[PDB]
Amino acid sequence: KLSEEQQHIIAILLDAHHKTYDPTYADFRDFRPPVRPLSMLPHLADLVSYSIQKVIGFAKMIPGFRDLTSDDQIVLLKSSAIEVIMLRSNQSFTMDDMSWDCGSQDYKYDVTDVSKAGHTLELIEPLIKFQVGLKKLNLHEEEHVLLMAICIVSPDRPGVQDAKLVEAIQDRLSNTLQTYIRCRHPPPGSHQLYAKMIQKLADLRSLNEEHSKQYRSLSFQPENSMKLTPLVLEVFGNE
């Protein structure tokens, strides 16, 4: 059974996500337009930079997150940002044609579009696999916002100074997720759900290292870095 406290955590996270994820995708209008070699780079940089902003907003609402030192906040967000973009995008991901569908043809991103941002099949192949895996878990929105939160507040990130504090927050988050599954997620959806979810977090780590490699290689070309946003360069292309 969920405690009041645990219910309080979920309500907050659903409100946090709903404040920061717009399923009408109305803001996409503002991005540099998409063109269908590196013709999708300006549009997809804009999309990612916006999504970083939304992720920061979400992260801020996580119970305990604001109470961390400023430096630890930055470290958690810099390392997690792309992983949460990948988690959050599953909500626009469709298994009919393996694409992210954001309401209109112009904001429908398939494999070729991701390659026109400059990325290779070595990233794209595992990314789609991940999205199929995650979509087939049929997560409750409660589980989806908890997984994003647990992703962010990871004590085992390089650079983390107060790991015991980060861990204290993660555990409250983890036990909440675990208790939700048992008493609120019906079987056999509940069958091995938690371990599979934890396994997704490992996949993201791996996906992250492959994003980092391809991001470094591409944004070394100053012509490509120019096409980025200041926040992207600050979050990805820093240090």
Partner: peptide, 7 residues
């Protein structure tokens, strides 16, 4: 850091 200011 504009990240710091978004916090």
């Amino acid at each position: 850091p504009m990240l710091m200011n978004l916090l």
